[PDB]
Amino acid sequence: MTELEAAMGMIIDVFSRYSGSEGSTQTLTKGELKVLMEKELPGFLQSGKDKDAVDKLLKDLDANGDAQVDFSEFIVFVAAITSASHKYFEKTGLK
Amino acid sequence: MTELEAAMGMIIDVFSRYSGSEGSTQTLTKGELKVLMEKELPGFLQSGKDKDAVDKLLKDLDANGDAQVDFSEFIVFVAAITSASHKYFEKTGLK
After folding, report:
1. B63 in contact with A at a CB cutoff of 8 Å?
2. CB neighbours (10 Å) of residue A49?
């Protein structure tokens, strides 16, 4: 757990706040994932939830499970979420 | 940026330090990378450099650019290094 590894430590932690330990099984279901989004995924809120984009913050990662997103699927796509927000955040976050 | 993306802030930050404006272009070249991993991947350093192992800590993310790793490519590999981060539990449950 260096600097990069500790940041992922807190993303695995975030997942361990909202999957909570278990909330489904030890995954974000689509119905859990939403309550996390308004807090830890601003900007992906362009739809805000409506089973449409909470569904895409699922469907992207969901490929690694089914639709109950494990910590693997989540942490892997938190490293995709960076590469989504940098397409245009306020400017192109980090370009 | 969010909490999740402030954490992404620090997993990208390692790349915002070394490649941290340009160094290569704005990629980890293999020759820049080799002094970072001593600091932010200490568990890879069981190999250490070898011009063929710093090269595999390249070739896994070099999928982008054959020896010039961009930010969004390092970051995918970093979200595999989350499975090395641990030290104690989900991450390190005792920090």
Report:
1. no
2. 18
CA B75 to chain A, closest CA, distance in angstroms equals 5
Question: Which residue of B1, B10, B72 is in closest CB contact with A3?
Answer: B10
CATH number of domain containing B71: 1.10.238.10
- Whether B82 sits inside 8 A of A12 (CB atoms) is yes
Residue numbers of the domain that contains A11: 1-95
Closest CA to B36 of B26, B28, B47: B28
Contacts of B39 in chain A (CB under 8 A): 2
Q: Does A81 touch chain B (CB under 8 A)?
A: yes
Which residue's structure tokens are 């995918």?
A: B76
> Cα separation of A35 and B23, whole Å?
40
Residue A83 neighbours by CB distance under 10 Å: 19
Domains contained in chain B, number: 1
B61, burial (CB in 10 Å: exposed 0-12, middle 13-18, buried 19+): buried
Q: How was this entry determined?
A: NMR
- List, in sequence order, every residue forming a beta bridge with B28; answer none if it has no partner: B69
Using a CB-CB cut-off of 8 Å, the residues of chain B touching A71 are 90
Residue carrying structure tokens 């992906």: A44
